[PDB]
Amino acid sequence: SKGTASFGKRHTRIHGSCRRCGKHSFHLQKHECASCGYPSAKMRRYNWSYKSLRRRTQGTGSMSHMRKVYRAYNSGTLKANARKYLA
Amino acid sequence: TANKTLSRKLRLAKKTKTNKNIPRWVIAKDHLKKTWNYKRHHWRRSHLKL
Amino acid sequence: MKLNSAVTASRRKCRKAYFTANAETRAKMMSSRLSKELRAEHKIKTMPIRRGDIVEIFTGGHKGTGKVVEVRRRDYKICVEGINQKARNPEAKPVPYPIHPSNCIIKELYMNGSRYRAIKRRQERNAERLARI
RNA sequence: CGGCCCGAGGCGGCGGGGGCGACGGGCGGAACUUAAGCAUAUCAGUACGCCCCGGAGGAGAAACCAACCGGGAUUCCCCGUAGCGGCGAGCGACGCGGGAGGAGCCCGCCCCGAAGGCGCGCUGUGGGCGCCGCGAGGGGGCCCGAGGGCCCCGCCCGAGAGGGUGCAAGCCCCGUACGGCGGGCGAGUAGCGCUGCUUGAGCGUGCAGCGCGAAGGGAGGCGCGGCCCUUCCAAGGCUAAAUACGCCCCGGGACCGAUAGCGGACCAAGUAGCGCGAGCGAACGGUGAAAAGGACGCCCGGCCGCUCAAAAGACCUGAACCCGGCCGGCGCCGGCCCGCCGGCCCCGUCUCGAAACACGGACCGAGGAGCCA
RNA sequence: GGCCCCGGGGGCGAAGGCGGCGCGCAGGCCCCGCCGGACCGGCCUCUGGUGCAGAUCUCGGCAGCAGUAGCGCUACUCCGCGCCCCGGAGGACUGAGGGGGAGACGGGUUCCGCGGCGCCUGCAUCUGGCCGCGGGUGACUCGGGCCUAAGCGGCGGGUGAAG
RNA sequence: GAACGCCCCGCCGGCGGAUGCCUCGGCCCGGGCGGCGACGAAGAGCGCGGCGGAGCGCGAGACGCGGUGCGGACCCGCCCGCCCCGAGAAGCACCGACCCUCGAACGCAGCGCGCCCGGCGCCGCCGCCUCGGCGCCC
Ligand SMILES: [K+]
Ligand SMILES: [K+]
Ligand SMILES: [K+]
Ligand SMILES: [K+]
Ligand SMILES: [K+]
Ligand SMILES: [K+]
Ligand SMILES: [K+]
Ligand SMILES: [K+]
Ligand SMILES: [K+]
Ligand SMILES: [K+]
Ligand SMILES: [K+]
Ligand SMILES: [K+]
Ligand SMILES: [K+]
Ligand SMILES: [K+]
Ligand SMILES: [K+]
Ligand SMILES: [K+]
Ligand SMILES: [K+]
Ligand SMILES: [K+]
Ligand SMILES: [K+]
Ligand SMILES: [K+]
Ligand SMILES: [K+]
Ligand SMILES: [K+]
Ligand SMILES: [K+]
Ligand SMILES: [K+]
Ligand SMILES: [K+]
Ligand SMILES: [K+]
Ligand SMILES: [K+]
Ligand SMILES: [K+]
Ligand SMILES: [K+]
Ligand SMILES: [K+]
Ligand SMILES: [K+]
Ligand SMILES: [K+]
Ligand SMILES: [K+]
Ligand SMILES: [K+]
Ligand SMILES: [Mg+2]
Ligand SMILES: [Mg+2]
Ligand SMILES: [Mg+2]
Ligand SMILES: [Mg+2]
Ligand SMILES: [Mg+2]
Ligand SMILES: [Mg+2]
Ligand SMILES: [Mg+2]
Ligand SMILES: [Mg+2]
Ligand SMILES: [Mg+2]
Ligand SMILES: [Mg+2]
Ligand SMILES: [Mg+2]
Ligand SMILES: [Mg+2]
Ligand SMILES: [Mg+2]
Ligand SMILES: [Mg+2]
Ligand SMILES: [Mg+2]
Ligand SMILES: [Mg+2]
Ligand SMILES: [Mg+2]
Ligand SMILES: [Mg+2]
Ligand SMILES: [Mg+2]
Ligand SMILES: [Mg+2]
Ligand SMILES: [Mg+2]
Ligand SMILES: [Mg+2]
Ligand SMILES: [Mg+2]
Ligand SMILES: [Mg+2]
Ligand SMILES: [Mg+2]
Ligand SMILES: [Mg+2]
């Protein structure tokens, strides 16, 4: 009875939703995320899984601020604004 | 459960609201032949982990 | 032979630019030649097609002449009045056979404030080139 | 009771923290593997873990190399054996020479003492490429559903790069060539003894812990003691260039062409789906020039037939294996016109020896293994 | 990369597919008929991810077997146009540790009304937890928020190359 | 005998998706560039269209708002709207704003609560206010 019968004893939630990364990975009894590492101040990142790195990284979201800053630099007026200030 | 936090209620509420077909005028507007929304789910065979 | 190295001569990139063009480029790409009579008067060779002009069609299986009722910019085609699909009923509605603007020659132009000016703008530049040459 | 010294709470202005599959700097640090075994050795001062910058970083103006009829900070490129090693397997710098690039300076100490950045400071401030726009030149005849086809005659060319257009277009349309705008010299140090790591560095290449601890000192690829010679000044600091590189944009190719090429060419791929979790992760491209996407009628889905060059009708072409209806007949080789006679075990493989009661193999398609440095 | 004598073959029909002659010892090549509907080569020189019957090969399709093996919980019947749905009448079952009435956890709209049968409901269906369209959970007194349990964090600092 | 099965003398149908041709995609090399953040980043959640699921985009000013230039007839369905020597649809470039919850994440907690009536996190540097000491002195 270590097989099918044992599976009928499952009515618990081990993990819940993380407040930082949103995934079903927050351990409700240890109070830590097994995906992003929260409540640690830095993000959990490992070089032995580059597939895990590409799933959540810079670029997989909106890039809302960084998009605007780059286009202002490349072709807008931001490089002029530094010359007035840095004088 | 009948005793749930408001945060879990809100994320469950969004999966219910977006579980819908493509409108038929959208099928005429965007000239589509794939008409099924494959992001739908059904309660008997789903494992929403929310 | 091309000399400018910022301009692609790659088939894949050129075909992608014909599709996925923005709307101002698509309008220019839907041009047609002016008739000889208008070539003398306006001193211009081609014009961008527009809703309200009169066109003489050749080279096709739907030759004729009529007014431009519609512009299907997504298809790069134009619907002319009188050039339809051969219909089934005697009563049923007409159905326009769509014509590519380069199979046309413009015979009379729709005029307004912007169309007079863009012609005059284009003659003065063509005279700069005729003075340089 | 004030001063100075050493602390405490609050308030104001300013700064720090996190983020990246590369390149760069600092630490900790394997094992598989090779040695035909295996301990030193090798793999490798690599994987991976932690910390820290930048557009580059690091390094840098000799306590240098040399042994010459001498050079002269750092980095990068071309070029080539001293040596280390169960002296086995393996491992391994560099100067001279040719080039790219080239740039030099400071503080402490000493002199003057507030001359200063003045609520501080005499326990020492201050001086010595991208944005615009014009843009040439072809007709007539047969034919087709449709002329970019065929026949015959021409024009443009600083433009015959190319894309589109109902079928192979310099001249049907966008472009392409020719141009304008912004433009006096450093002490718990150096060194030494013992111990651990590291190096080609070998009676020590570089580092470190602990004990000891200098005054003129350091170096000269074999130790110790003595005498010379040659050549430099550590224990403090700054510095451009030549060099390296992903994401992202731009151009190019004797590269792949939908089981290939990225896992990912398909309005919704790190998606749908699976795992308590760390994590794992698909399949699916193509009607036609135009949706013209299916008339009218007859029976109660079918028939007839309409659009179209064509149903190409849910779609290009449409092979094999396998199957249903009509028609004909009753395994390979050889002779004869033709069902008789004659010959014929199941291939691939290991093996002295296979038809083997030795193993693999229902069938069919597509992919599938000596290339490169 | 070249040549193909007024500049190689093509909607007067390319490549591919299905049958049928010929040529070559052979690998293979060439032609014709039908299909298909837009591209393809012979000779010289150059290049390589360059030839399949097998690997308990990989992925896809699929045959015989074969209309075969197979479809606990006592039970349904008559009539209503009648389905296992609904109604009436009869016959039975669960048997108060219930096939009853309700909560906790887990599920997440499965709840309700009207419509419907394309999918599912391993037989059927007019049924339905299935599909379409509308709706739906009201607190001073019930619970959560508060208290503390076993525990778990924090603490001038301490330690470690850091984390 | 017939039938079943098998071969094909030929003519038609199924099932399946190979072959051929096609390609808004990959891969390789080269050149640029090297531009984030407490002025709240990267990332996550939730919400926003007249009829609106997914993805893109945007933030209660939400499928966008303004300003300067350019452009000049459309806006995939159904509607609306625009139409003219300027009256102004598609489109483009720069600039100014708006910018919900979580996150380095900042009153405590993570969805519930406070102190105070402006507000209310930690570290560091420079100043300043108010202070302690049987430290050295007076
Ligand atoms: K069991
Ligand atoms: K955890
Ligand atoms: K409930
Ligand atoms: K479920
Ligand atoms: K190591
Ligand atoms: K090892
Ligand atoms: K071993
Ligand atoms: K070993
Ligand atoms: K050794
Ligand atoms: K070793
Ligand atoms: K050996
Ligand atoms: K030089
Ligand atoms: K044309
Ligand atoms: K000393
Ligand atoms: K020492
Ligand atoms: K060594
Ligand atoms: K030695
Ligand atoms: K010692
Ligand atoms: K010597
Ligand atoms: K030495
Ligand atoms: K020596
Ligand atoms: K794949
Ligand atoms: K064998
Ligand atoms: K064997
Ligand atoms: K044997
Ligand atoms: K055999
Ligand atoms: K035998
Ligand atoms: K046998
Ligand atoms: K054998
Ligand atoms: K056996
Ligand atoms: K066998
Ligand atoms: K069977
Ligand atoms: K019903
Ligand atoms: K330490
Ligand atoms: Mg077990
Ligand atoms: Mg537990
Ligand atoms: Mg402060
Ligand atoms: Mg290896
Ligand atoms: Mg070995
Ligand atoms: Mg071995
Ligand atoms: Mg071994
Ligand atoms: Mg080594
Ligand atoms: Mg530097
Ligand atoms: Mg070593
Ligand atoms: Mg330095
Ligand atoms: Mg693929
Ligand atoms: Mg077909
Ligand atoms: Mg053997
Ligand atoms: Mg064997
Ligand atoms: Mg077998
Ligand atoms: Mg094959
Ligand atoms: Mg190849
Ligand atoms: Mg091969
Ligand atoms: Mg095969
Ligand atoms: Mg009973
Ligand atoms: Mg119900
Ligand atoms: Mg059934
Ligand atoms: Mg109470
Ligand atoms: Mg949406
Ligand atoms: Mg907050």
Automatic annotation (TrEMBL), chain A:
Belongs to the eukaryotic ribosomal protein eL37 family. Keywords: Metal-binding, Ribonucleoprotein, Ribosomal protein, RNA-binding, rRNA-binding, Zinc, Zinc-finger. Signal peptide: none annotated. The keyword Chloroplast does not apply. One of its GO terms (biological process) is translation. This is Ribosomal protein L37. GO terms for cellular component: cytosolic large ribosomal subunit. Mg(2+) binds at residue 29. Component of the large ribosomal subunit. The ribosome is a large ribonucleoprotein complex responsible for the synthesis of proteins in the cell. GO terms for molecular function: RNA binding; rRNA binding; structural constituent of ribosome; zinc ion binding. NCBIfam families: PRK04179.1 (NF003214). It comes from Giardia intestinalis (strain ATCC 50803 / WB clone C6) (Giardia lamblia). Disulfide bonds join 18-33, 18-36, 21-36, 33-36.
UniProtKB/TrEMBL annotation, chain B:
Transmembrane segments: none annotated. SUPFAM superfamilies: Ribosomal protein L39e. Keywords: Ribonucleoprotein, Ribosomal protein. InterPro entries: Ribosomal_eL39 (IPR000077), Ribosomal_eL39_dom_sf (IPR023626). One of its GO terms (biological process) is translation. GO terms for molecular function: structural constituent of ribosome. Pfam families: Ribosomal_L39. Signal peptide: none annotated. One of its GO terms (cellular component) is cytosolic large ribosomal subunit. The keyword Ribonucleoprotein applies. The keyword Ribosomal protein applies. HAMAP family: Ribosomal_eL39 (MF_00629). Belongs to the eukaryotic ribosomal protein eL39 family. This is Ribosomal protein L39. It comes from Giardia intestinalis (strain ATCC 50803 / WB clone C6) (Giardia lamblia).
TrEMBL record, chain C:
Signal peptide: none annotated. GO terms for biological process: cytoplasmic translation; ribosomal large subunit biogenesis. One of its GO terms (cellular component) is cytosolic large ribosomal subunit. GO terms for molecular function: RNA binding; structural constituent of ribosome. SUPFAM superfamilies: Translation proteins SH3-like domain. Keywords: Ribonucleoprotein, Ribosomal protein. Belongs to the universal ribosomal protein uL24 family. This is Ribosomal protein L26. It comes from Giardia intestinalis (strain ATCC 50803 / WB clone C6) (Giardia lamblia). The lineage of its organism: Eukaryota, Metamonada, Diplomonadida, Hexamitidae, Giardiinae.
